[PDB]
Amino acid sequence: HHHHHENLYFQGGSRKKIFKPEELRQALMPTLEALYRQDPESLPFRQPVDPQLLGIPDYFDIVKNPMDLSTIKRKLDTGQYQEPWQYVDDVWLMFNNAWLYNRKTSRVYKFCSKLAEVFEQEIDPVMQSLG
Ligand SMILES: COc1ccc2c(c1)c(C(=O)Nc1cc(C(=O)O)cc(-c3cnn(C)c3)c1F)cn2C(C)=O
């Protein structure tokens, strides 16, 4: 959760601007696209986890707030984010759920780490420009 330390405007205080959905798409969709471009690493993250399909019925005992790339895409596509930090926190939620649910020595854990590396590189300059 180190990103809470930077861009303190998103952490708290009074409203200084209204982000329009188009503004957020233009700034943020490229960072999401960067994750989708990771093949094979994005494949476990392009749809919500389906416990019955994947044989992991305990999934929702562990992960209370599921998230995935397609949901994040949809929220950007339909204007459901009011501010950029909400998008960033959903990306981190997706990664944190995967790292929580999966052992370190499983494929999905490894793929999560790769995607997290890619995201950090793409997002940092973007969030500076929006803060
Ligand atoms: C069996 O144990 C687990 C445990 C956690 C998993 C997954 C599996 C997982 C996953 O396998 N997602 C997934 C889902 C689907 C789907 O159709 O819903 C498809 C793939 C997939 C697509 N192509 N490939 C090679 C794999 C895919 F990787 C995604 N997970 C997450 C994000 O935690």
Curated annotation (Swiss-Prot):
UniProt organism field: Homo sapiens
Linked pathology: Chromosomal aberrations involving CREBBP may be a cause of acute myeloid leukemias. Translocation t(8;16)(p11;p13) with KAT6A; translocation t(11;16)(q23;p13.3) with KMT2A/MLL1; translocation t(10;16)(q22;p13) with KAT6B. KAT6A-CREBBP may induce leukemia by inhibiting RUNX1-mediated transcription.
Region (Interaction with histone): 58-104
Subcellular location: Cytoplasm; Nucleus
Domain notes: The KIX domain mediates binding to HIV-1 Tat.
Bromo domain boundaries: 19-126
Taxonomic superkingdom: Eukaryota
Modifications after synthesis and translation: Methylation of the KIX domain by CARM1 blocks association with CREB. This results in the blockade of CREB signaling, and in activation of apoptotic response. Sumoylation negatively regulates transcriptional activity via the recruitment of DAAX.
Positions of region (Interaction with ASF1A): 96-114
Biological function: Acetylates histones, giving a specific tag for transcriptional activation. Mediates acetylation of histone H3 at 'Lys-18' and 'Lys-27' (H3K18ac and H3K27ac, respectively). Also acetylates non-histone proteins, like DDX21, FBL, IRF2, MAFG, NCOA3, POLR1E/PAF53 and FOXO1. Binds specifically to phosphorylated CREB and enhances its transcriptional activity toward cAMP-responsive genes. Acts as a coactivator of ALX1. Acts as a circadian transcriptional coactivator which enhances the activity of the circadian transcriptional activators: NPAS2-BMAL1 and CLOCK-BMAL1 heterodimers.
Protein name as catalogued: CREB-binding protein
Effect of residue 99 to A: Abolishes interaction with ASF1A
Assembly, per entry: Found in a complex containing NCOA2; NCOA3; IKKA; IKKB and IKBKG. Probably part of a complex with HIF1A and EP300. Interacts with GATA1; the interaction results in acetylation and enhancement of transcriptional activity of GATA1. Interacts with MAF and ZCCHC12. Interacts with DAXX; the interaction is dependent on CBP sumoylation and results in suppression of the transcriptional activity via recruitment of HDAC2 to DAXX. Interacts with phosphorylated CREB1. Interacts with CITED4 (C-terminal region). Interacts (via the TAZ-type 1 domain) with HIF1A. (Microbial infection) Interacts with HTLV-1 Tax, p30II and HBZ.
